[PDB]
Amino acid sequence: GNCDVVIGIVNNTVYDPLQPELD
Amino acid sequence: GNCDVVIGIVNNTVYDPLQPELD
Ligand SMILES: *[C@@H]1O[C@H](CO)[C@@H](O)[C@H](O)[C@H]1NC(C)=O
């Protein structure tokens, strides 16, 4: 979805395992 | 987890298709 639709959602950072390996 | 606590354990390599896929 979009961030606006849900209620009580908190800004945070999600980490991806794949990106470090690629670099 | 880490490979210390579990009572019965065996050694084999989890293939992780990812390394092959990136290259
Ligand atoms: C949580 O409850 C407070 C009142 O205690 C209210 O002001 C706030 O908007 C509520 N937040 C959510 C995300 O439901």
Q: How was this structure determined?
A: cryo-EM
Distance CA A23, CA B5 (A): 33
Cβ atoms of A2 and B2 within 8 Å: the answer is: no
Residues in chain A within 8 Å Cβ distance of B22: 21-22
Cβ atoms of B19 and A21 within 8 Å: the answer is: yes
The CB-side HSE value for B13 (13 A sphere, CA atoms) comes to 3
CB contact under 8 A, A18 and B19: no
Residue to probe by mutation, ligand 1, list A5, A6, A7, most atoms within 8 Å of CB:
A7
Distance CA A18, CA A22 (A): 6
- φ/ψ of B16, rounded to 5, equals 55, 80
* Closest CA of chain A from B22, distance in Å: 7
SS3 A18: helix
